Design a protein around this ligand. Structure first.
Ligand SMILES: O[C@@H]1[C@@H](O)[C@H](O[C@@H]2CO[C@@H](O[C@@H]3CO[C@@H](O[C@@H]4CO[C@@H](O[C@@H]5CO[C@@H](O)[C@H](O)[C@H]5O)[C@H](O)[C@H]4O)[C@H](O)[C@H]3O)[C@H](O)[C@H]2O)OC[C@H]1O
Ligand SMILES: O[C@@H]1[C@@H](O)[C@H](O[C@@H]2CO[C@@H](O[C@@H]3CO[C@@H](O[C@@H]4CO[C@@H](O[C@@H]5CO[C@@H](O)[C@H](O)[C@H]5O)[C@H](O)[C@H]4O)[C@H](O)[C@H]3O)[C@H](O)[C@H]2O)OC[C@H]1O
Ligand SMILES: O[C@@H]1[C@@H](O)[C@H](O[C@@H]2CO[C@@H](O[C@@H]3CO[C@@H](O[C@@H]4CO[C@@H](O)[C@H](O)[C@H]4O)[C@H](O)[C@H]3O)[C@H](O)[C@H]2O)OC[C@H]1O
Ligand SMILES: O[C@@H]1[C@@H](O)[C@H](O[C@@H]2CO[C@@H](O[C@@H]3CO[C@@H](O)[C@H](O)[C@H]3O)[C@H](O)[C@H]2O)OC[C@H]1O
Ligand SMILES: O[C@@H]1[C@@H](O)[C@H](O[C@@H]2CO[C@@H](O)[C@H](O)[C@H]2O)OC[C@H]1O
Ligand SMILES: O[C@@H]1[C@@H](O)[C@H](O[C@@H]2CO[C@@H](O)[C@H](O)[C@H]2O)OC[C@H]1O
Lengths: 429, 429
């Protein structure tokens, strides 16, 4: 349709996936969100080395199939993660080196891909191969020590194991074009195409935080890699803070590159995140959509301080007598130029007034008063501005409502079940 | 003395306490904070009715004493809580009614106060006596039905039991002077004082949140009760969101009333709170001091938009070329009127620039670069403004530092072990 991420993404020929954790599929709230919003799936850990080959030569796909089965059963495609890398290697593989490790690497690829032959759309054949020391060179691991040619071997090996799959190179901190790591990966992919090494895509994990923040030049990076003759994909997206603007900007970068297959966010709810502390996903603990979700959905569909006029009463959201007192319920009044009517929507999804006061709801049920309270980040102060013009309380899940459909000055604002009514739509100015 | 809350408050003859949970006195991380920051203690539950008299006439002081001893052995006074109220009554008292209840109430008071006779500074003789129905009348409880004079009786009983302890009436939602409930309590205490009813104080639980927000008239309330000849005390303070200003405001209201004995916060760390979802205390779960902690400390020691100038350099905190790019490290620069030099300290402990950008630290160690990043509420975007001029990151516990003690334009800002150096002191005007 256009009401869920997967569907909106499809309007541009793209997909929108998430990372599924089999241990959570038993959680109905989890599966309800995951099944409805995404049309692409990645196993968070079930298809990795230690999970698929517990002992040398002994393969094990019970965990992986558990995820795969759920995906196909729910009309989702699957991304294979990951075939050859230094992290999460089972004990036995960690003790290997030289040609012994090299062949173990090849045997692992053959075993996993053979089992999933023709069922996986994309395979992260190699991941985390470059360093972060800022040199843009190869990562120093037991795999790289077997010879610089190990990555090329894994790809030729993967192409032979399942010709139907797209073979991707996956890595993080390669989104900023100015970072050496990014360029090092570009030169390798470039080298591969020139020599005819099988490689169909580059996956940019996209784990953004204040350590390695999103930079708008990410679009040039996608363009650049796409120009090498490969498809690009945002594979493990999550943003510390979950800024609406940052999440919206990444969505647009991909929509600007025809070779960008889609976006996968690393998880469903912040509580499921490997970095829940950074609350970097689109849904939060209770399964409610975050400000960033709306921003992402809006971007997929096409897309400072100001006033919030209610298209249906003509009056603006106003703080009674321009009070600065916490607990003051807002009202509707004749739009004019005064700070008591200037609302700023933040990347956190707050409707700030006076700079540090936040549109607040002291409850969740219908009839709950909408007031101003010191900003502290509570979901009861977070909002989602829907494209239809409604403002939904992230925590309540209710729309800002003009009491008794009133339209006269002094009409209080309240929380009520959304109705698409005129007393629930607004326009920014 | 003024490096800890207890000592700072002691400067003015007051105390700063907390609520101790017997179950955590074996948690060194917990006791390390508690024993250092407070000089007044209240058993969070150990001294309540159900806890001290599990069977009528059969008293159990095992847990109360554990807390009482820990307190005295650690230089803290003790507030008994609570002797006669409707909540948390053992199952056998709830069933009681009429004169048999009145008698039980009397005996409980004598039994418990007898045990602690002479050891308790303050006793919450009666608590939660008034309703929240707007009429300013007594809440309808099995105790109130035994006769409206139960409160007076409990107090006369208490006085006789321990003439040495200060007897307080305790309640919530009686901080706002305009509320009916507050007036009801006011009249009762005023009536008691005139008739000679032995009540020495009124405790204001002070549980503030968007539901029952703090209001500056709280001081007026305190001042009015004090005028009646009874001491006042903030007994169970906690503020939803832990706003710096609100916490400092409550502290100054008590400093403003000579009869205000002191302030008690209902818990040590947010994780210990009965309402952790509201992160209403002064210490985070990891034990680090929150922005509000310093706001209170500074206040105890006597005490929108602007420049932050370095003392040692004479230059201001500046964002290179007014960039709004996340990850941009800030520097020192000749002070001038421009938005890339106007920082706003919010109640959340943030230092905002451009309205929605936050002073950000991407790590917790020395040499961590200080930059701007979209505001989202992380502890690495919260700061404490020490009274010495230094600015300490909440999460890191590190000071803003002008690299290498540089004083020239272009000197970058980093995190570093606080040293009282002039490249770590700042004056904001
Ligand atoms: O359940 C868990 C799985 O979810 C988990 O999945 C893996 C998560 O993502 C990938 O692995 C991690 C990628 O991010 C790495 O951390 C980087 C390190 O660099 C930071 O930036 C640095 C800032 O300072 C500079 O000086 C420096 O040069 C920069 O590099 C960046 O901000 C961090 O995000 C982690 O170490 C990786 O583990 C991987 O694809 C997923 O499979 O796996 C574990 C499982 O338990
Ligand atoms: O370990 C736990 C102990 O910590 C715990 O200690 C007791 C906790 O409760 C304390 O008393 C509480 C005071 O606050 C009450 O809630 C008020 C109710 O009113 C709300 O505001 C209303 C909003 O709606 C409006 O219409 C209405 O007019 C407003 O009044 C306000 O926001 C809430 O905070 C609690 O119900 C009381 O329990 C007590 O003193 C402590 O000793 O005990 C349990 C133990 O396990
Ligand atoms: O217990 C406290 C002590 O820890 C504290 O120690 C002081 C800490 O600051 C020291 O001065 C620092 C030294 O580093 C400078 O920055 C570095 C400059 O070179 C760069 O390459 C590097 O990246 C920067 O990190 C910093 O500007 C400067 O302030 C000081 O000498 C120590 O004594 O002292 C107080 C104790 O109570
Ligand atoms: O008790 C309630 C009153 O406090 C409440 O007062 C309203 C305060 O706002 C008045 O309108 C202002 C006109 O000027 C604009 O600039 C302001 O933004 C408006 O808020 C309004 O007329 C007052 O009634 O009224 C309702 C009472 O129950
Ligand atoms: O207290 C009353 C409210 O409960 C009432 O709420 C209305 C319910 O229907 C919705 O369609 C309206 O938008 C909403 O205002 O409003 C009147 C008020 O007195
Ligand atoms: O030379 C450059 C500096 O100019 C820049 O900082 C700006 C200097 O001019 C001031 O008016 C601006 O406020 C300030 O941000 O920093 C980078 C340095 O290379």
């Amino acid at each position: 349709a256009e009401s869920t991420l997967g569907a909106a993404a499809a309007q541009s020929g793209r997909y929108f996936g998430t990372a599924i954790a089999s241990g959570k599929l038993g959680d109905s709230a989890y599966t309800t969100i995951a099944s409805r919003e995404f049309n692409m799936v990645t196993a968070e850990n079930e298809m990795k080395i230690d999970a698929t080959e517990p002992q040398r030569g002994q393969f094990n796909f019970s965990a992986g199939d558990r995820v795969y089965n759920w995906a196909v059963q729910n009309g989702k495609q699957v991304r294979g993660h990951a075939l050859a890398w230094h992290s999460q290697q089972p004990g036995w593989m960690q003790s290997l080196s030289g040609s012994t490790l090299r062949q173990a690497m090849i045997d692992h690829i053959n075993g996993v891909m053979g089992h999933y032959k023709g069922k996986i759309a994309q395979w992260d054949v190699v991941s985390h191969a470059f360093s972060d020391d800022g040199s843009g060179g190869r990562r120093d691991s037991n795999l790289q020590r077997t010879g610089n040619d190990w990555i090329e071997v894994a790809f030729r090996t993967a192409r032979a194991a399942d010709p139907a799959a797209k073979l991707c190179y996956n890595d993080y901190n390669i989104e900023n074009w100015t970072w050496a790591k990014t360029q090092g990966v570009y030169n390798m992919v470039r080298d591969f195409k020139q020599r005819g090494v099988p490689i169909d895509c580059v996956g940019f994990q996209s784990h953004f935080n204040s350590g390695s923040p999103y930079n708008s030049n990410f679009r040039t990076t996608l363009q650049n890699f796409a120009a090498l003759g490969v498809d690009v994909a945002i594979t493990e997206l999550d943003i510390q803070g979950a800024s609406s603007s940052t999440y919206a900007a990444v969505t647009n970068d991909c929509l600007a590159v025809s070779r960008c297959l889609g976006i996968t966010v690393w998880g469903v709810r912040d509580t499921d995140s490997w970095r829940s502390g950074d609350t970097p996903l689109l849904f939060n603990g209770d399964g409610s959509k975050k400000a960033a979700y709306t921003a992402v959905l809006n971007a997929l569909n096409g897309g400072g301080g100001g006033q919030i006029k209610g298209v249906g009463s003509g009056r603006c959201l106003d703080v009674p007598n321009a009070s600065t007192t916490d607990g003051t319920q807002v009202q509707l009044y004749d739009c004019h130029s005064a700070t008591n009517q200037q609302w700023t929507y933040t990347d956190a999804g707050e409707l700030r007034v006076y700079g540090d006061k936040c549109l607040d709801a002291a409850g969740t049920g219908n009839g709950t008063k909408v007031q101003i309270y010191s900003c502290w980040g509570g979901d009861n102060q977070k909002w989602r501005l829907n494209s239809d013009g409604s403002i939904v309380g992230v925590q309540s899940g209710l729309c800002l409502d003009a009491v008794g459909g009133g339209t006269a000055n002094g009409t209080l604002i309240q929380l009520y079940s959304c109705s698409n009514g005129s007393n629930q739509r607004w326009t920014r100015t």
